[PDB]
Amino acid sequence: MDPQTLITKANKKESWRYDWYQPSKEKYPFRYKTWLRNQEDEEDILDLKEFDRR
């Protein structure tokens, strides 16, 4: 099948980004990269039995 619909039909949900964050006490005078929660608005197949050892 198509490589994306093999994934979506399988394994049955948020997204995450590695982003700068400025924390609150208001806002601290720095930032830092961390894993911030994404908000609402935020190819090929090898044929098997080719690498099968025999």
Place this chain on the structure above:
Amino acid sequence: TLNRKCVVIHNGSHRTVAGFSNVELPQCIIPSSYIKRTEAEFIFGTYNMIDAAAEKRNGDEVYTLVDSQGLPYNWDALEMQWRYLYDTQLKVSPEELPLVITMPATNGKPDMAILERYYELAFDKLNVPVFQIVIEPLAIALSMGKSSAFVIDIGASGCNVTPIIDGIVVKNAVVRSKFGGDFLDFQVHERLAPLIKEEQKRSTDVWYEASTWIQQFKSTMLQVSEKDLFELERYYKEQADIYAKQQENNPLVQKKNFLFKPLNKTLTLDLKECYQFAEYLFKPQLISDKFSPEDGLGPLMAKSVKKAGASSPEQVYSLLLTNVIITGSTSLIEGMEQRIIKELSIRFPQYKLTTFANQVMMDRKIQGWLGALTMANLPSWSLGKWYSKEDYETLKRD
């Protein structure tokens, strides 16, 4: 907690300990020295430095980065050490994550310059977005669960005793002794020098010996007298005479044997000789007349307690002597804590000594790093002074 990940870097006098905040053990424990190889090449790391010093190449020179004060003094190679941390060990940009670094307890003068150096090191060189300075005897004290504590960090540079009352460091009573691990590196290598046929520029050879077999002698052959050594021979014979009389031998003459690895030779030292090196931490007059007993650890216990009483003294005395924290890599030798127990109970017999120590061997070497680790995971940034780039920009103005 906070959605964060901090960088924890501890620059001790002998070991540069670095790791992350989301882990409990450090990413690396590299030495606080480097081989300058001569073009100049600054070899950092543990295995890269022991292999380069085992080559015994000319032009190689082990140069330290942190002096006996606990302060960094070679800031450019410490930057290159910190570049070796962030890239080769931490594998992260220094601008991505916050930083937490360690400072020794001082009397108050040399902090602002080293803060300005740490301003020049975190911002001007690494572009760390925020770095937090914690005090290493304070960070050790809080990580054991104390806001008021009596911390003694016996490192390689010496003994660093620090009285702490209620979160603030009593700075005028902070005394830093000279006799510690690198001094024990000197004394052990001196007495075994007829037994090993041996007896800066050759500090490539000197630090290599101190990191391979002199560190092996202090970890295995060294025993500290838990009394004074003259008091210990008096105490051990009087108990053995009771053991002989109640039923119907000298414990010094127990031949503790050291297999010297560069020569394949037994180094037979009896237990008094193992007691002899550790005596100089508490009686440094046993090597030279220039060292008072106050310069040793024993009378420096009472001197740091009595100066903290003038921070009403006798409550400060009972505050410290019931909150004794023992830490350091040199304190891992057997009998270190009981000698501090004896030398302080003979100087304060009225007060009962309750001394605490991280009994884990690895965790007491990195207790300054583990002290900064707990401060790196605080769930409020108002719990510690987090030096933003603005905090250097307000220091730049006049």
Place this chain on the structure above:
Amino acid sequence: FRQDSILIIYPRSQTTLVQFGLNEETFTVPELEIPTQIYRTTRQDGSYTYHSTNKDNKAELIKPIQNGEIIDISAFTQFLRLIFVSILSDRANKNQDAFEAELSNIPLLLITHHSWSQSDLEIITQYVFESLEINNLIQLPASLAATYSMISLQNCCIIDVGTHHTDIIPIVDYAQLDHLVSSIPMGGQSINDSLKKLLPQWDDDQIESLKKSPIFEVLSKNSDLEFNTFWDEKGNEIKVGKQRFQGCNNLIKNISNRVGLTLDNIDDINKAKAVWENIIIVGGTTSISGFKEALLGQLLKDHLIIEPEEEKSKREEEAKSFVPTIEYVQCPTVIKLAKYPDYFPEWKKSGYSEIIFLGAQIVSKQIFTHPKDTFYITREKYNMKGPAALWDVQF
């Protein structure tokens, strides 16, 4: 979970061992040995499209792992996507209802390396749960998968002799001392290139076939006869003399020096000796016979604590006038190889050179056949912290 839905990926510098589903009677050899390589088409506008084959000779061959290190974190994860979808298509081709039985909930176990970065491991956590959409993920180290393939001894030492590198890892308390993990850049090719020095008139193919010959052993009968004949990859008979007994000594001496410098910095004396008594030497290189016994004997030669043979012999002459031995205080008094698991039939058949894969089958029978989610991130834990939840499921 269902044990047929269990997926284990062991990616290396050269190859990648893949097995989807446990045999449930005995644990078997990994059948799929895919080379760790992806094909990067430089798509116009700058985008990348990652392929299994050379897409019209516009793709470049990107091997995302060399010497165990991830060098391309997006190309590795898309090569993980390349392998995973190839399992998803084959299970959709073989079973055709696998999306409700074999693919409806897939527990993924990616065997990780010590040299993989924290940002690299977190992008893998970001990739598996968003693009791969896989509901669970174990990021098991290659060091801890090796000691969980053995009898799960509490203190061990891992010597991962690869093709171009050797990873020397101490293990105490089922954990990794990251401040003592070192890796020399000397692997299976160091055995080959030392035979290039001993056999200059040969090529790389005859020496690698000599390294893959059955007559290549290390001394610590082949030993009695001087010359022996092996076969080439093309079937040509080639004679060799005593060079089949050498070529391994430089790698053996360099490992034992790096092992001895690693475990001497363990200040806890009780923890270090059980590491010294549980030496584990693994890798695709380590299929050479006699390599582990001489590497053990070199540790007996360089790091075994004993009274010196000159000092014992003088004292034995002094007793000739019963010998009590000199008692030292240093830790490596006994140096032993760890006992290997001799109860898997298929792993005894195909060798234990890839034994890191076998402990993953035990960990996936430990964690994926038990309801405890303490060592894998769920969909809930990814919706809580994301890749920040990766450092709550580590060993």
Place this chain on the structure above:
Amino acid sequence: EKRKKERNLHLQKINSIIDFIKERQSEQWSRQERCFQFGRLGASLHNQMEKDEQKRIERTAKQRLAALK
């Protein structure tokens, strides 16, 4: 007034950092115990995979007489 707020915020900063470290002290004890148990729990599955595959070897050795006849 202003003096009551400073002493209480100092006591709150003292007690909370003591409490949060004691939380992370217990987090240090909790994570190491799981590493000890699941390592030995992996050792238990080793003995589980041992006894299942050892009786398979013992049964086929007795069934060699059926192959022998």
